[PDB]
Design a protein around this nucleic acid. Structure first.
Ligand SMILES: [Mg+2]
Ligand SMILES: [Mg+2]
Ligand SMILES: [Mg+2]
Ligand SMILES: [Mg+2]
Ligand SMILES: [Mg+2]
Ligand SMILES: [Mg+2]
Ligand SMILES: [Mg+2]
Ligand SMILES: [Mg+2]
Ligand SMILES: [Mg+2]
Ligand SMILES: [Mg+2]
Ligand SMILES: [Mg+2]
Ligand SMILES: [Mg+2]
Ligand SMILES: [Mg+2]
Ligand SMILES: [Mg+2]
Ligand SMILES: [Mg+2]
Ligand SMILES: [Mg+2]
Ligand SMILES: [Mg+2]
Ligand SMILES: [Mg+2]
Ligand SMILES: [Mg+2]
Ligand SMILES: [Mg+2]
Ligand SMILES: [Mg+2]
Ligand SMILES: [Mg+2]
Ligand SMILES: [Mg+2]
Ligand SMILES: [Mg+2]
Ligand SMILES: [Mg+2]
Ligand SMILES: [Mg+2]
Ligand SMILES: [Mg+2]
Ligand SMILES: [Mg+2]
Ligand SMILES: [Mg+2]
Ligand SMILES: [Mg+2]
Ligand SMILES: [Mg+2]
Ligand SMILES: [Mg+2]
Ligand SMILES: [Mg+2]
Ligand SMILES: [Mg+2]
Ligand SMILES: [Mg+2]
Ligand SMILES: [Mg+2]
Ligand SMILES: [Mg+2]
Ligand SMILES: [Mg+2]
Ligand SMILES: [Mg+2]
Ligand SMILES: [Mg+2]
Ligand SMILES: [Mg+2]
Ligand SMILES: [Mg+2]
Ligand SMILES: [Mg+2]
Ligand SMILES: [Mg+2]
Ligand SMILES: [Mg+2]
Ligand SMILES: [Mg+2]
Ligand SMILES: [Mg+2]
Ligand SMILES: [Mg+2]
Ligand SMILES: [Mg+2]
Ligand SMILES: [Mg+2]
Ligand SMILES: [Mg+2]
Ligand SMILES: [Mg+2]
Ligand SMILES: [Mg+2]
Ligand SMILES: [Mg+2]
Ligand SMILES: [Mg+2]
Ligand SMILES: [Mg+2]
Ligand SMILES: [Mg+2]
Length: 232
RNA sequence: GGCCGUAACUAUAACGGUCCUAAG
RNA sequence: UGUACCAUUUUGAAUAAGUGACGACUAACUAUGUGCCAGCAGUCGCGGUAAUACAUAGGUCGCAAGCGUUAUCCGGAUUUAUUGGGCGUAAAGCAAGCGCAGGCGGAUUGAAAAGUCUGGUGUUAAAGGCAGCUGCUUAACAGUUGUAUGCAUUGGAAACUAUUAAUCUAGAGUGUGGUAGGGAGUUUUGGAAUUUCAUGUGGAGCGGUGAAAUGCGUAGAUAUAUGAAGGAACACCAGUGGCGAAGGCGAAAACUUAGGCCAUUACUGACGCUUAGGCUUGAAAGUGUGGGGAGCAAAUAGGAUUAGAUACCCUAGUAGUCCACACCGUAAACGAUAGAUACUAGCUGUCGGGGCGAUCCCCUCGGUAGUGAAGUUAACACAUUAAGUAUCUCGCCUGGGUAGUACAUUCGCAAGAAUGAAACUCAAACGGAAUUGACGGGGACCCGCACAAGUGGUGGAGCAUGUUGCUUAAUUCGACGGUACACGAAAAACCUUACCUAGACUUGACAUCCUUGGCAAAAUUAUGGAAACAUAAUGGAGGUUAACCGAGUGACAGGUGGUGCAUGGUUGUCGUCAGCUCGUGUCGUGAGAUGUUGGGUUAAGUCCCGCAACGAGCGCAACCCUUAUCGUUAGUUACAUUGUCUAGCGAGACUGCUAAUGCAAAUUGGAGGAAGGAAGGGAUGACGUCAAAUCAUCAUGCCCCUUAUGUCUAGGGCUGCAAACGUGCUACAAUGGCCAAUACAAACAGUCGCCAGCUUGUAAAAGUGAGCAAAUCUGUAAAGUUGGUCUCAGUUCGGAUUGAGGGCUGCAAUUCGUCCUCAUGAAGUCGGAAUCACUAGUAAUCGCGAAUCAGCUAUGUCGCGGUGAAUACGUUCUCG
RNA sequence: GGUGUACAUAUCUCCCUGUCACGGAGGGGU
RNA sequence: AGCUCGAGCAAAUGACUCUUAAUCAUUGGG
RNA sequence: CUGCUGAUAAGGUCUUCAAAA
């Protein structure tokens, strides 16, 4: 049957919030809730070739701070910091010139075990007419070789352009979805194929969190150094 | 021994309802 | 015949390519159109609005001066099986026996040489086939040489078959000796029991069924005792049995009579096996003539059940069942397996003869059974009594339906029996065996407010809301058993709004890309106006164009338009039920099986033992939140009757200790404990089913519209109304109506708000006006307690409906808001068949708060507290 | 009476069932 | 009226469904 | 412990493929 969202079930217990701010009134709460959505959607739908794993937003009465974790931040940086100013102006237009922007790019360590970029690669391969069995097999084998626990990939839709929708699942390793202690990262993406839309959902297991607390700690960004700038 | 209705072209009624008789 | 052919003879790519196919067999794919229509097809099969199968185009493939379609013949087809098949369950062993002709047939000797083998000779016309070569430019073709098969005659071979002449006993019979039998026919005899009749006792029913009714009975039934008559069948013995060729044979006896088993120093000396045709027997039903008739019972009559009952049940009841004599000649006549002969492990019973001599048991020869390896089989299974290794003979089979039908023939008194097709039609068949599920008015076990025990309702009345139907210009669309119907919609007067009428607009109300300037858009005031929009005004923030304000400009924007059966995402349901699978291994030709089943224990595929399985994943459980006790931290805005209360951390409960029994998991009881054996509640919902729901949250393939299906505005509509259903509220009342005083909550919410107090008003509310950005101020707690009154009535119940006067929100309250006051006072007195929820702070009942919201008959939804029950014996029934 | 003679059949509404039939409750028509 | 006596069939249009049948309405047709 | 217990319009998806990593 239907299952609750893996991220939503674990939020507020073993996962911190992607946007951390306290608005003044109900009128401002909607504007701030929509502007952050616009910024995140921008960073995800465009500038996709940089493998942006996640973007967090942190706002005060008047100051906006953006933390963009990316696997290949060279594409965000551009040639001698060219596209950086373009995305800065895009964000400033999105929120407002009256505020102070503190954009900060962060190179994410051990990218392979991140469901967002795994799903994005899956969707890109699907859209590029790559055969599905080979695509999922190579993604699963590279994810496992990255040194993580089980990964479950569900790819549904008009499969290979067929007129009857199917679904194909590959679980390889233990994926306890009912357990709350487990560190399960879940992402979902849409491959826009010439025959319609394909939905790819990737669950990845990254061990068990044996330290009680609302995170306040990096999650698989720490194995190598996670120090990139563009801030003040 | 009667009467009435009834089958996907028409037609008919395998079938159904009912009155009476000792039995039709 | 100026022909084949030849030549440096002039001209010149000039004079020349189609057909089938492209989903698989079978080499070769895309678009357009159609939309179970038009059409294709050798077979499977395509076409229901996304067709590589249809029609067209493009592309590609197979051949080519040919290519396809049609007809016929052969092969593939071992599919008439001599080479070269079968008959237990798929088509096929006659019902069984006695058997002439035919086929086959023990051992040895001799002769001949009919089959068999071999040499010589004659012939088997030429052409054709195969091999070699020559000639046409090579080939096709022509020519040339070689090249078999059968018959006859003659000459040899003698192993095998046939013929003839004989010998032998081992096959088969005969005799003597042992011997078991429900083998058969004819004639007598016997006892239980039913029925009828006769005679006694007796007094209201008997009979029959799921329940009854026809029926029998005070004319004395059923019952009981004695006797008589007649008919049919022969309890117990009676079997993990006997006899016969099969059908079949079971009370006792006599007579006549058939076959079989064992041992044979005896005799005949191959006399044997099978058997077309022929003859004999052949369950039961049926026929003809004559007898007989107790019981039972086709046909028939009535009573029931039933929608109907010509059936199942019951009461009667003729033929028949019985005997003699003549026919019929069919059966699931079955071991679904023809007979004969030789060989091939074993183990356990039982029956008969023989060897020993208490039984019992041992050996030998046979009959009848079970288990079982080799071997066979598609598998089930057979397996010394073969379906195994082989031979001989007979019968039979050749896809399903037509059809065991029709015609002809033979038999019969008759019903009918034997024999037995085709025309036509299908691609398979009420084909065989086995596997996984589903299902069973099939079993075993186990669960759930499922049944049971209770409480309170629903269906009856009025009202609110939703839906079906109908009406209308529109009554926008969706949801339709459980899993739709107070659902999307957590707010339809305008807006919402997607609908109708009407007034207006066109790169557009909104956006990007481009050539281009910014020295605007708003808002408001005038006039025209239903408002959209037009003509004039202040010409505007700013920052030189950043955003936006424009001109030009074609790509286009736009669509709540269709398709949820093209999809992503999200969700309902089985179901918080305990299941769903995988890797390796093993078993099986294969689908598949094992693990996952078996025994215990749980809510659990939870765990422990067992086990050709060993492990693993998702699901289960725990980790998460909250309630129940306590410690510590902190004491304001809580408390301030001093330790409540609020919120961080922590302790505590772990089958931890004990007794019982179990191998162990574990189950039950006790102690202490606030809490005991998932302590209560929540979040958490596996693979998948229903092509389940949503294109109208959003996104999106494809189709459709593009001065209109896109856009703005005003009015109407979503609120209609003979009706029907669902979900709720209010009641029909003294456990109550009205009035007065009055005590005790939790949670939540609040600066276009919560609104304390005061004044005004019968009241909704109005004015003034503090307090509160909140543990501080505000949002009246009601049921409950006491007192007064009503006194069982359509009422001081019940409030619907209706008229009038007012309050608030809002441009605007008529369609269509709600509140207050006054007045009127429908139905309804406990609700038919039938149904719903609930296992403790639960049902019932009483209030309070919040979300969407200017306002709202939300009586709806989500939450909070006050009072606070009854019952669970049990799984026989009911749903899952 | 709509059909055979107030009755039955038939008609309508509600139960029943996945649905229909059967079955059960109620109403009307000379 | 196309057929049987404005009615009922026949035909068409829609609703309905994956598409039909059936059903539901509407409807021209003397 | 044997009441009664009848029926369900037609055609249909759904495996694309292992060449291989
Ligand atoms: Mg063709
Ligand atoms: Mg074609
Ligand atoms: Mg042949
Ligand atoms: Mg043939
Ligand atoms: Mg054969
Ligand atoms: Mg047979
Ligand atoms: Mg036989
Ligand atoms: Mg036979
Ligand atoms: Mg014989
Ligand atoms: Mg003979
Ligand atoms: Mg010749
Ligand atoms: Mg020649
Ligand atoms: Mg007697
Ligand atoms: Mg007889
Ligand atoms: Mg009768
Ligand atoms: Mg019956
Ligand atoms: Mg009788
Ligand atoms: Mg007779
Ligand atoms: Mg026969
Ligand atoms: Mg027999
Ligand atoms: Mg056996
Ligand atoms: Mg035939
Ligand atoms: Mg025959
Ligand atoms: Mg047949
Ligand atoms: Mg069932
Ligand atoms: Mg049952
Ligand atoms: Mg009950
Ligand atoms: Mg109530
Ligand atoms: Mg009611
Ligand atoms: Mg729609
Ligand atoms: Mg509607
Ligand atoms: Mg629908
Ligand atoms: Mg409106
Ligand atoms: Mg200016
Ligand atoms: Mg300028
Ligand atoms: Mg669906
Ligand atoms: Mg199982
Ligand atoms: Mg086993
Ligand atoms: Mg086991
Ligand atoms: Mg759980
Ligand atoms: Mg559907
Ligand atoms: Mg539904
Ligand atoms: Mg659309
Ligand atoms: Mg309007
Ligand atoms: Mg409505
Ligand atoms: Mg009182
Ligand atoms: Mg105070
Ligand atoms: Mg007050
Ligand atoms: Mg009182
Ligand atoms: Mg009354
Ligand atoms: Mg009153
Ligand atoms: Mg009004
Ligand atoms: Mg009363
Ligand atoms: Mg319970
Ligand atoms: Mg449709
Ligand atoms: Mg009954
Ligand atoms: Mg029928």
């Amino acid at each position: 049957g239907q299952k609750v969202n893996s991220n939503g079930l674990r939020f507020g217990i073993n996962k911190n919030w992607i946007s951390r701010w306290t608005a003044n009134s109900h009128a401002q709460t909607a504007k701030w809730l929509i502007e952050d959505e616009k910024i995140r959607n921008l960073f995800f739908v465009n500038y996709r070739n940089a493998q942006v794993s996640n973007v967090e937003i942190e706002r005060t009465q008047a100051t906006v701070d953006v933390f963009v974790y990316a696997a290949q931040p060279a594409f965000l940086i551009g040639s001698e910091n060219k596209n950086i100013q373009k995305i800065t102006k895009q964000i400033k237009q999105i929120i407002g010139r009256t505020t102070n922007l503190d954009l900060t790019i962060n190179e994410i360590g051990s990218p392979m075990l991140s469901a967002r970029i795994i799903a994005r690669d899956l969707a890109n391969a699907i859209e590029a007419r790559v055969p599905l069995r080979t695509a999922m097999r190579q993604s699963l084998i590279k994810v496992l070789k990255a040194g993580a626990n089980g990964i479950k990939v569900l790819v549904s839709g008009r499969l290979n352009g067929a007129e009857i929708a199917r679904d194909k699942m590959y679980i390889e390793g233990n994926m306890p979805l009912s357990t709350l202690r487990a560190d399960i990262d879940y992402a979902l993406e849409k491959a826009q194929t010439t025959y319609g839309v394909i939905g790819v959902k990737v669950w990845i297991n990254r061990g068990m969190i044996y330290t009680k607390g609302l995170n306040r700690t990096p999650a698989h960004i720490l194995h190598p150094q996670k120090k990139q700038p563009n801030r003040q």
